[PDB]
């Protein structure tokens, strides 16, 4: 399931993700443009033998179990399988242990792509 | 924070090569780092990692057995011996880290690889 930009923003909303430790709403609707493209589906093997899952690519090394990986600490007590549902609660309960641990700082895409930027554009034009 | 490999070269089927990193900028002792490879033109494999002070290390399951890696903490570098070198090995190697952990995609920092023939 590919989210439209909206679509992603409000499910986030609902989800309560707006302003959560402060980080806005346009933080996380961007982090999954550049993490997942808006893919609940998308599936990377990473360079470490770790696996990002889902529409906010959840590591398999820290904090979800997928079976496959090195020094697997599984912090969300998650399966990493159930990540990848269309409907983003499991990713967005997972999202609050992460953000709760180094901020967004945790997504590597976040860092790099819409830290510092006017992630509320992403946002801009959504009821 | 520099990450510079070193001992790539020619080899035939079989042998053997042990590859070097040189690591400064950061604290080594404790630091995870791996290796981590791009056959031509495959994506970035995980070749293998070393984690912690504990120094509990892991690899590939298509090089189990075969390669071994090691810090050799009183030159602070990072070595990586590959036995039984096979065709499907040929690629560039890379010494990778985290910048800042934990963090998703895996190692987001190497250095600039160094490059093994296996013919």
Redesign the interface.
């Known amino acids: 399931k590919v989210f439209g930009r909206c679509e992603l923003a409000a499910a986030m909303k609902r989800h309560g993700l707006d302003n959560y430790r402060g980080y806005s709403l346009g933080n996380w609707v961007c982090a999954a443009k550049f993490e997942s493209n808006f893919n609940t589906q998308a599936t990377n093997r990473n360079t470490d033998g770790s696996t990002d899952y889902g529409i906010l690519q959840i590591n398999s090394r820290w904090w979800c179990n997928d079976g496959r990986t090195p020094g697997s600490r599984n912090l969300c007590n998650i399966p990493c399988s159930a990540l990848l549902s269309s409907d983003i609660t499991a990713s967005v309960n997972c999202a609050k242990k992460i953000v709760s641990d180094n901020g967004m700082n945790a997504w590597v895409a976040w860092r790099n792509r819409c830290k510092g930027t006017d992630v509320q554009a992403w946002i801009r034009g959504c009821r | 924070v520099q990450l510079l490999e070193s001992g790539g070269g020619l080899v035939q089927p079989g042998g053997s090569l042990r590859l070097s990193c040189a690591a400064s900028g950061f604290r080594f002792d404790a630091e995870?780092m791996?290796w981590?490879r791009q056959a031509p033109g495959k994506?970035?494999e995980?070749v293998s990692?070393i984690?912690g002070p504990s120094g509990?290390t892991?690899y590939?399951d298509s090089v189990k057995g075969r390669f071994t890696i090691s810090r050799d903490n009183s030159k602070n570098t990072l070595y990586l011996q590959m036995n039984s070198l096979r065709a499907e090995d040929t690629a560039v190697y890379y010494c990778?880290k985290?910048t800042?952990?934990?963090?998703?995609?895996?190692?987001?920092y190497?250095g600039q690889g160094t490059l093994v023939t296996v013919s």
Request: proline share 9%; charged share 10%; glycine share 14%.
């Open positions: 995870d791996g981590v994506g970035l995980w990692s984690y509990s892991y590939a990778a985290y800042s952990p934990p963090q998703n995609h895996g190692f987001d190497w």
